Amino acid sequence: EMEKEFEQIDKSGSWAAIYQDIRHEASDFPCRVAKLPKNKNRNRYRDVSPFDHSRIKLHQEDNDYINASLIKMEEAQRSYILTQGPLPNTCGHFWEMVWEQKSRGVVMLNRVMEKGSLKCAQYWPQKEEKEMIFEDTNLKLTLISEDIKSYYTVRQLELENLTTQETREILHFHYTTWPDFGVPESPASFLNFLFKVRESGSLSPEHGPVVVHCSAGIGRSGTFCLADTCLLLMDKRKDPSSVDIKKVLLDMRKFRMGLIQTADQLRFSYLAVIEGAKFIMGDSSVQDQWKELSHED
Ligand SMILES: O=C1CN(c2csc(-c3ccccc3)c2Cl)S(=O)(=O)N1
């Protein structure tokens, strides 16, 4: 269905129509907490807010608000936290969330600067010797090491709760070649990256939800999560035909608005999943193929 639908939608050039229908059917819930006057400076974008029912609450005294949503996929049995690229004043909140939610990995799909503008604060240390201390949330962050690839970087960070002195290892998966409102260079480079996150164990149910973000936390982030969830469902059932991508996307949209921002990102989601199915169903040789095609070295 997904593959016959793809060639079909593609033979009639109606991706914009298909995408817009999803937008029209998308859920609409209130974001009153996000719209409160006191939270205006905690939002990067006026028109991108987390619904109240699924927002992540900071276990905080003063203000529990952060622009982040818990995408809880009941059937797939995996959860993700999609959030905006933290602001200069919310980096402490960002790491507090990571700590309280017990996340093991953080997936970043954007670059700090895109099109001459700052789409995300430098929330992690770029140098081992220069660790970061977030005074407001009493947290300390240290870069332990990093493995730089051609189009993505994986970092090992140590997050410490200065209050209790406990420490945890956080893995940072940074995709540096995914244009804003754009799509990855190829399904291969994307899957190669997705599988790296999977192999790390960061998506395991034994950990808290992986934190995923781009600039707004809905376009590139939504694409990443949709593809992952679809492959997971398919994997659980070992049946590619039982996956209704559009349905999954609509379910995800019940938890955060605007997931997947362009018709091409949706189209790319299909490509990624269709190609990923090969591995899921037993052709693991393809994993090595993506690695080659991605040109990561
Ligand atoms: O592919 C994308 C595009 N992204 C966006 C950047 S500004 C933006 C936006 C800001 C304000 C109003 C409407 C839309 C969105 Cl949406 S994202 O960083 O969520 N991933």
Side-chain angles (χ1 to χ4, degrees):
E1 172 62 7
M2 79 176 301
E3 199 175 335
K4 318 176 320 217
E5 208 201 327
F6 180 102
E7 308 182 317
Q8 165 184 296
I9 296 173
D10 220 41
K11 76 188 179 188
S12 60
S14 60
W15 280 105
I18 293 299
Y19 177 59
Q20 286 308 314
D21 291 343
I22 284 168
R23 298 191 63 239
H24 178 275
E25 298 166 50
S27 302
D28 189 31
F29 295 111
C31 306
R32 300 156 189 172
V33 178
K35 288 300 179 182
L36 292 177
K38 67 176 180 182
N39 294 320
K40 186 187 172 186
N41 71 16
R42 290 188 178 202
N43 295 309
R44 176 177 295 281
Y45 301 118
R46 183 195 64 185
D47 305 330
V48 177
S49 306
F51 299 134
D52 298 307
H53 83 82
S54 56
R55 77 190 184 84
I56 293 295
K57 300 183 182 183
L58 298 173
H59 297 177
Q60 167 170 308
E61 34 260 344
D62 189 48
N63 191 337
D64 70 6
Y65 181 80
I66 182 174
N67 191 315
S69 313
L70 176 70
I71 311 305
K72 187 176 183 179
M73 303 311 277
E74 198 191 331
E75 208 206 321
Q77 290 181 285
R78 178 168 292 173
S79 293
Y80 316 80
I81 288 183
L82 273 59
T83 186
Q84 60 178 25
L87 295 161
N89 64 312
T90 67
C91 292
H93 303 153
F94 177 85
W95 286 112
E96 179 187 347
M97 172 173 72
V98 171
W99 182 275
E100 302 174 342
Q101 302 309 312
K102 294 174 168 60
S103 300
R104 159 72 167 160
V106 169
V107 177
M108 175 169 185
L109 306 170
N110 69 96
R111 279 180 302 129
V112 171
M113 180 176 281
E114 309 190 313
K115 305 173 197 154
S117 182
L118 292 149
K119 310 298 182 176
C120 183
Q122 186 52 56
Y123 67 92
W124 77 92
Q126 295 166 287
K127 296 183 187 306
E128 287 85 336
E129 66 273 21
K130 282 202 163 272
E131 76 280 1
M132 289 174 79
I133 292 188
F134 303 98
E135 292 195 302
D136 64 322
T137 55
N138 209 220
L139 259 20
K140 178 176 167 184
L141 184 66
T142 305
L143 172 65
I144 296 304
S145 65
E146 67 185 316
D147 185 16
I148 305 172
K149 296 306 207 178
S150 93
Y151 70 103
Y152 72 99
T153 298
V154 176
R155 308 189 179 72
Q156 182 185 353
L157 305 166
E158 176 172 302
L159 179 64
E160 190 186 325
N161 181 342
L162 266 37
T163 298
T164 57
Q165 239 175 254
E166 181 193 333
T167 81
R168 292 175 188 166
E169 180 183 83
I170 306 295
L171 298 179
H172 199 236
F173 297 94
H174 191 181
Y175 198 115
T176 61
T177 52
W178 192 339
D180 186 40
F181 281 108
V183 297
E185 284 188 49
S186 69
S189 55
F190 172 81
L191 290 171
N192 185 55
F193 178 82
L194 172 58
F195 278 52
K196 272 250 151 173
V197 176
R198 290 182 159 214
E199 303 195 318
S200 72
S202 303
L203 305 183
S204 168
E206 294 298 78
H207 294 306
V210 64
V211 173
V212 184
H213 84 82
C214 40
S215 182
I218 59 176
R220 290 169 280 179
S221 293
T223 301
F224 176 89
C225 296
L226 176 63
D228 183 60
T229 290
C230 284
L231 291 171
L232 175 59
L233 291 171
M234 177 188 299
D235 196 13
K236 173 180 70 69
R237 307 197 276 264
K238 287 301 184 301
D239 176 10
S241 292
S242 68
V243 180
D244 187 319
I245 305 176
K246 291 190 277 57
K247 243 81 161 191
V248 179
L249 180 48
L250 286 173
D251 192 60
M252 291 185 66
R253 282 203 174 207
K254 297 180 176 180
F255 303 94
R256 189 175 176 77
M257 61 167 76
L259 301 180
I260 299 230
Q261 281 289 292
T262 66
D264 208 49
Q265 290 183 343
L266 174 66
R267 175 176 185 289
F268 182 90
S269 297
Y270 272 69
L271 285 177
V273 177
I274 292 173
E275 177 58 38
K278 299 173 181 178
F279 174 86
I280 297 304
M281 299 307 285
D283 179 357
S284 299
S285 80
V286 70
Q287 181 162 11
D288 295 304
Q289 307 215 65
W290 302 328
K291 186 178 179 180
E292 223 72 344
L293 297 172
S294 67
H295 307 138
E296 60 173 51
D297 292 304

